[PDB]
Design a protein around this nucleic acid. Structure first.
Ligand SMILES: [Mg+2]
Ligand SMILES: [Mg+2]
Ligand SMILES: [Mg+2]
Ligand SMILES: [Mg+2]
Ligand SMILES: [Mg+2]
Ligand SMILES: [Mg+2]
Ligand SMILES: [Mg+2]
Ligand SMILES: [Mg+2]
Ligand SMILES: [Mg+2]
Ligand SMILES: [Mg+2]
Ligand SMILES: [Mg+2]
Ligand SMILES: [Mg+2]
Ligand SMILES: [Mg+2]
Ligand SMILES: [Mg+2]
Ligand SMILES: [Mg+2]
Ligand SMILES: [Mg+2]
Ligand SMILES: [Mg+2]
Ligand SMILES: [Mg+2]
Ligand SMILES: [Mg+2]
Ligand SMILES: [Mg+2]
Ligand SMILES: [Mg+2]
Ligand SMILES: [Mg+2]
Ligand SMILES: [Mg+2]
Ligand SMILES: [Mg+2]
Ligand SMILES: [Mg+2]
Ligand SMILES: [Mg+2]
Ligand SMILES: [Mg+2]
Ligand SMILES: [Mg+2]
Ligand SMILES: [Mg+2]
Ligand SMILES: [Mg+2]
Ligand SMILES: [Mg+2]
Ligand SMILES: [Mg+2]
Ligand SMILES: [Mg+2]
Ligand SMILES: [Mg+2]
Ligand SMILES: [Mg+2]
Ligand SMILES: [Mg+2]
Ligand SMILES: [Mg+2]
Ligand SMILES: [Mg+2]
Ligand SMILES: [Mg+2]
Ligand SMILES: [Mg+2]
Ligand SMILES: [Mg+2]
Ligand SMILES: [Mg+2]
Ligand SMILES: [Mg+2]
Ligand SMILES: [Mg+2]
Ligand SMILES: [Mg+2]
Ligand SMILES: [Mg+2]
Ligand SMILES: [Mg+2]
Ligand SMILES: [Mg+2]
Ligand SMILES: [Mg+2]
Ligand SMILES: [Mg+2]
Ligand SMILES: [Mg+2]
Ligand SMILES: [Mg+2]
Ligand SMILES: [Mg+2]
Ligand SMILES: [Mg+2]
Ligand SMILES: [Mg+2]
Ligand SMILES: [Mg+2]
Ligand SMILES: [Mg+2]
Ligand SMILES: [Mg+2]
Ligand SMILES: [Mg+2]
Ligand SMILES: [Mg+2]
Ligand SMILES: [Mg+2]
Ligand SMILES: [Mg+2]
Ligand SMILES: [Mg+2]
Ligand SMILES: [Mg+2]
Ligand SMILES: [Mg+2]
Ligand SMILES: [Zn+2]
Ligand SMILES: [Zn+2]
Lengths: 52, 83, 99, 50, 239
RNA sequence: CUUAAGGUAGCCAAAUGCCUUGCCGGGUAAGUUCCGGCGUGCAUGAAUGGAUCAACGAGGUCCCCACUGUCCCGGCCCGGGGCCCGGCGAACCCACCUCCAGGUGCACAGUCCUGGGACCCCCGACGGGGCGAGAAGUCCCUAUGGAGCUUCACAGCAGCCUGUCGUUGCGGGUCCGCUUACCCGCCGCAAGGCGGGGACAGCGGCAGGCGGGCUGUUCGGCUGGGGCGGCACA
RNA sequence: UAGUAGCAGCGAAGAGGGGUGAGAAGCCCCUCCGCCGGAAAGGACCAGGGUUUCCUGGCAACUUCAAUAGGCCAGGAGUUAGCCGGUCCUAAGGCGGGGCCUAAUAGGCACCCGCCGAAAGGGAAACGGGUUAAUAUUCCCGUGCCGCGGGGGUAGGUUCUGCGGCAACGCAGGCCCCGUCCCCGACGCCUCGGGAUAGGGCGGGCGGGACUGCCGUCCCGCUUAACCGUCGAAGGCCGGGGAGUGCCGUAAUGGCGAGAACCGGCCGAAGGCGGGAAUAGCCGGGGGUUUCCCCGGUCCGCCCGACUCCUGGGGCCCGUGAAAAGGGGACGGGGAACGAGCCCCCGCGCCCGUACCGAGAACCGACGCAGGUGCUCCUGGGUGAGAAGCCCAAGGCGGCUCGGGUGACCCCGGGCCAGGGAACUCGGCAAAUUGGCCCCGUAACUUCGGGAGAAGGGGUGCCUGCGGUCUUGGGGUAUACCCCCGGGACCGCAGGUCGCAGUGGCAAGGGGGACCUGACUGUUUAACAAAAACAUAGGUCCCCGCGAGCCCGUAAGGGUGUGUACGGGGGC
RNA sequence: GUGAAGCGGGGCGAAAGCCCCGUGGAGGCCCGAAGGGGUUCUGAUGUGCAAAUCGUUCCCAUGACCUGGGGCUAGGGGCAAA
């Protein structure tokens, strides 16, 4: 059930929406901050040195 | 508004129109009537069906009106006259 | 001794489940719980209504009072009742102590 | 969805405005060098993450 | 991963917490009640172990107290040092005569009541030691303690006694009770798990554990925890 | 006597009995299974639960009646594949590509030796062979490879307990008392008040103990495969 | 490899004639044939999708085949609101500032302050008809409602108070500001009486339609929104009355000097009826032109009746079934001289959503995917216990997107098989038997509940009459009984009669004896294990008197705990 | 479908009581659609309709029941009728 049948349940929900600061589809609506730029939890822009 | 009609919060009323169609009208349920502050029973004179807030209801012509029943008022007055 | 059963009585709703000993403890309690008792206030022999465990209501005089979980008055509760309700015994003792 | 927020609706509008191939006179002007647009998409295949 | 169930409880996850929003309020003495009041309601409170009385004082202050057995709606109760030791009255402990059954006993004045609050329980006033403002009481467990003589108790026994004598005949019945409480229901035995999940988990013939010392760290301190003894011999030595 | 006692009530060739298809009955024409008894029981037994089956069971098993294409033993029919035509039109796999026998060979040859055959091409079918295809064998061993788990392994770290240094002050003769430190609770928006404890406790440093709760690791070699043994390891 | 596999299987499918076109089995029209019809299929619609919607044109590519078709391509167009939703409120919870903690932060949060948090909870106010290629409670017509504000009239007021009634309570009940209190908002599950409406049916009437061998039957229309008024069943209450030889009852429990019967009254549903409103819509018959005008009907009398709506009674809980905004009332304090909850009249109501799919081709699964999401909510007639199956409406579909020929083997899925009847096989696996309802009858054992549908025996169609028990209206002196007439439900008796077969299809238990084992219902290895494993109620032991015990956190602090030994935690 | 407590009547009887019939409507009750689950054929499929499906036969189906939306718990950590 974990494969194709369970993919059927990804048709209606969401974890992220578009972020007003960076524009990516990365704003976690439940956590209320952006997974990409950190908007909503960090006034500084999130970017780590381990990322190229 | 469709899941809102799947809940039973509104009455489902089936009605025929002058055009010959049978439709469903989703209508509000009645609000609860005023109750006695002591016994919790509905107060006389104010237990008419009301379907929205903001409608003035006339209380009976008695001290403390639509707050307690006549039975509670009379007993409380009897206690105070003695005391 | 019951309406349709010999011994199970109210525990007849359980059928043959849970064991004789368990269903017997239920029957022993529920015969008193669902039987008729005396109202502490009006002394009428009435089937008191249990609103919840420990809460009892008299349908005749409206007396609402705290009692046992399954019976209106526990054994130890009976000895420490409020004395506003033991008015019959205060007058009975005085009448014997006067005439 | 039936009940849209306007901000999402305006991003959908932008994708609708951009979803089209270069005009035919652009193909002529560039000697057939420009014939496709990267914004060209089909609603069933390439999904917007709107 | 490897943290055992008792260790996860302390994180305060939803499945371990008390759904206290299901109740009307704490059952405690307010700090400044005095005079006469009226029992205006007697209520079932989800997850509690006894019925609760709503009391209205003359100055309009309302508070919840556990209902004494025999207490009735409309009864006039008295609060304070001048109150007679009648059932439902709230008295300072230094004023309660010896041999009196009391409940909802404060340990220090103003803590709201700490001891003998479950249904059917009571505390006995054993003695008075007023030269240092202490009252001696016996708690439901049988332990004898000293309490602040200025603290408050209620006269009588807690109503709702006998609840635990009736069996929870089905699993479903305890399930509904647990949902009003904080208990995680149901419980899995330690020896029913694999070793990563419990000290008792594991072997081909699973076994319980011997007691751990009081100094054992969390995650090790399960089973018998620094027990004085175990079994029937411990009960016999307890007596 | 041995590391204390010395298997009680019960129960059994048990989902627990190797010997063992145990022995005697039942049931069958014939019963290694099953049922009922028997019991110095390889190695049964009391909340490590014993005995125990009413009710319940997609649990595991034996017997009886009914029933039947399960079978004796196979036949005919129906719909769709199939086959043929029109249309669309892949994949697996593929060093090259192979008639048969008996040998030989890295010991199981399409290709080497000695024979025997075969006119060539095409269609359908099958699954004997191509040590057929699929997947760097999970079995087994090796590696001074891992992971997770265990503890009486080698170490270590938290946590808890215990002493000590500091917090720690003030009176009186190590003891008593005190409160203002500090701690605990109530009230208050705060200010501060009330009660309890009290130089204790709590907290920080240092020290000892317990400490697989958690972290890192080591768990040798030879070996008619490994392992046990042995030391043919000096 | 190979012009090979697949384009079968999951209970629908096509055919004839005509038109268009270069070209037609496949596009368009009619006829015939079929499938769904409590739905892989009709009606509605959330999320998600985002233009897939509509019109015109087209066929290089795209669609398991074709194409003149299309969710494809090109060009153009389309979503209209004070009353439908959001918006407002709070829930579980969350975020920010302050503070406290931190080497530090973008890390933590017990505290203070604020805010966010529901397109299914709470919550102001719109319905019917018409219109477009495509929107429709949004446009247009008609008829209304809500909130806020104003003008006029009126009741009322202008030191002071409204009037009536024994009462329950009734009635235009002055104006402005402020406070406090109460109530509504505001609540589970099970069960059974009552009242309605939607829908369905029967007989008559008027109009229209179907068919032709015989009969003359069969089918369709006959509708009525919101809103205003009035009436009000249960239930509760008021006055009279004053009851134990009791007396009054229910579907059931029952009620009464702690006040019954009985009499009179008060408050009081869904909904009915009038107004709306026949002028609309529908049906039939005509005349125009581009959707307009005229004419006739739109009826009489009964029955069933919900899963929809309302109401009340009873029971259950170691389970007690949210909160707030908002609203109503009362009780007070202050102010003005005016002035309403009534009648007429005037003004204003921003912002965002609104197309379409809503799935066997518009969502997710790489697909125009037999899965998943959503059958989430709704559904006529006959048979029937049934929202089962089977057949047929309303409505839709033949697009679970290859066609034709042949009638070898073999395969998949079905039917039947003489005699024997488990001899098959690890094993009765598979298949078969049984099967509904009524009557008779039913063992050991047992925790006395059960076992039990034990087992076992018998009946069952159709037709012709004769009855019974009720029910629903009307008419008879006539509120029950009785008689007459119309409709509905259920049950029985006598007789006749056909078949191989009468629960005739559909639908639909094989049964019994014993052992082991887990008491039971429940849970589990999403993708090889459903079990004797886990859980369980019950038993028992341990740590603990709360500044506890146990657990989380670097810390600030936290969980148990809105708790307190009839308790929290930890084992077996 | 069964028919607990409770409540009527009748019969036997010296008392207690016992028996028959009815009423009543309890239950992690039973048969069985929807819905949920996933036992068998070790059926079909097994370059699939599908990186877990289909048919058939089954288990539960008033409750420790099934299901939508919102919320909380995060990696040596969570959550676990295990
Ligand atoms: Mg996974
Ligand atoms: Mg989420
Ligand atoms: Mg709503
Ligand atoms: Mg509501
Ligand atoms: Mg998609
Ligand atoms: Mg809980
Ligand atoms: Mg295990
Ligand atoms: Mg461990
Ligand atoms: Mg250990
Ligand atoms: Mg172990
Ligand atoms: Mg022995
Ligand atoms: Mg045994
Ligand atoms: Mg033996
Ligand atoms: Mg055996
Ligand atoms: Mg032994
Ligand atoms: Mg054992
Ligand atoms: Mg043993
Ligand atoms: Mg046992
Ligand atoms: Mg089961
Ligand atoms: Mg071909
Ligand atoms: Mg050789
Ligand atoms: Mg070769
Ligand atoms: Mg071939
Ligand atoms: Mg290898
Ligand atoms: Mg490998
Ligand atoms: Mg080496
Ligand atoms: Mg110290
Ligand atoms: Mg220290
Ligand atoms: Mg280790
Ligand atoms: Mg070594
Ligand atoms: Mg070696
Ligand atoms: Mg060796
Ligand atoms: Mg083929
Ligand atoms: Mg069909
Ligand atoms: Mg077709
Ligand atoms: Mg059909
Ligand atoms: Mg049907
Ligand atoms: Mg549909
Ligand atoms: Mg279209
Ligand atoms: Mg077109
Ligand atoms: Mg397009
Ligand atoms: Mg909000
Ligand atoms: Mg439309
Ligand atoms: Mg008619
Ligand atoms: Mg009845
Ligand atoms: Mg629309
Ligand atoms: Mg398709
Ligand atoms: Mg039709
Ligand atoms: Mg074909
Ligand atoms: Mg035969
Ligand atoms: Mg045989
Ligand atoms: Mg054989
Ligand atoms: Mg079978
Ligand atoms: Mg059949
Ligand atoms: Mg079981
Ligand atoms: Mg599995
Ligand atoms: Mg399985
Ligand atoms: Mg077990
Ligand atoms: Mg036991
Ligand atoms: Mg033990
Ligand atoms: Mg059941
Ligand atoms: Mg299998
Ligand atoms: Mg198979
Ligand atoms: Mg195959
Ligand atoms: Mg069932
Ligand atoms: Zn961002
Ligand atoms: Zn009483």
């Amino acid at each position: 059930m974990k494969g194709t049948p369970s993919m059927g349940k990804h048709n209606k929900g969401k974890t992220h929406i578009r972020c007003p600061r960076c524009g990516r589809h990365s704003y976690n609506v439940t956590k209320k901050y952006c997974a990409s730029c950190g908007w909503g939890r960090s006034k500084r822009w999130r970017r780590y040195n381990w990322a190229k | 508004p469709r899941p809102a009609y799947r809940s039973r919060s509104l009455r489902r009323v089936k009605v025929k129109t002058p055009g010959g169609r049978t439709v469903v009208h989703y209508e509000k349920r009645a609000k609860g009537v005023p109750k006695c502050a002591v016994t919790g029973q509905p107060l006389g004179g104010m237990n008419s069906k009301v379907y929205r807030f903001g409608i003035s209801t006339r209380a009976p012509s008695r001290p403390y009106g639509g707050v307690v029943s006549h039975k509670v008022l009379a007993r409380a007055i009897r206690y105070a006259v003695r005391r | 001794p019951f309406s349709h059963t010999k011994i199970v009585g109210p525990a007849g709703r359980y059928g043959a489940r849970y064991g004789m000993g368990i269903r017997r403890k239920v029957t022993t309690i529920e015969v008193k719980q669902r039987g008729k008792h005396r109202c502490p206030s009006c002394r009428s022999l009435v089937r008191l209504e249990r609103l919840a465990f420990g809460i009892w209501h008299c349908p005749k005089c409206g007396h609402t009072f705290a009692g046992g979980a399954y019976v209106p008055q526990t054994i130890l509760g009976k000895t420490i009742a409020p004395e506003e309700l033991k008015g019959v015994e205060a007058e009975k003792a005085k009448w014997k102590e006067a005439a | 969805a039936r009940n849209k927020p306007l901000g999402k609706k305006l991003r959908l509008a932008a994708a609708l405005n951009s979803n089209r191939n270069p005009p035919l006179w652009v193909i002529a002007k560039t000697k057939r060098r420009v014939t496709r647009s990267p914004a060209r998409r089909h609603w069933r295949r390439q999904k917007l993450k709107a | 991963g490897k943290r055992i169930l008792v260790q996860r409880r302390g994180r305060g996850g939803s499945q371990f917490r008390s759904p206290s929003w299901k109740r009307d309020g704490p059952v405690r003495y307010p700090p400044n009640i005095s005079g006469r009041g009226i029992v205006v309601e007697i209520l079932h409170e989800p997850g509690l172990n006894a019925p609760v009385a709503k009391i209205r004082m003359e100055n309009g202050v309302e508070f919840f107290n556990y209902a004494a057995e025999g207490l009735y709606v409309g009864q006039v109760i008295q609060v304070g040092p001048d109150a007679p030791p009648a059932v439902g009255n709230v008295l300072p402990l230094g004023k309660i005569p010896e041999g009196t059954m009391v409940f909802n006993v404060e340990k220090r004045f103003g803590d709201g009541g700490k001891f003998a609050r479950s249904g059917g329980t009571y505390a006995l006033v054993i003695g008075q030691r007023p030269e240092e403002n202490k009252t001696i009481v016996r708690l439901p467990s049988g332990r004898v303690i000293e309490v602040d003589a200025r603290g408050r108790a209620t006269i009588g026994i807690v109503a709702g006694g006998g609840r635990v004598e009736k069996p929870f005949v089905k699993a479903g019945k305890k399930y509904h009770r647990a949902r009003a409480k904080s208990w995680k229901y149901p419980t899995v035995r330690g020896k029913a798990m694999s070793p990563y999940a419990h000290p008792h988990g594991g072997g081909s013939h699973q076994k319980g554990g011997t007691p751990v010392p009081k100094t054992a760290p969390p995650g090790q301190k399960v089973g018998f925890i620094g027990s004085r003894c175990t079994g029937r011999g411990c009960v016999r030595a307890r007596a």
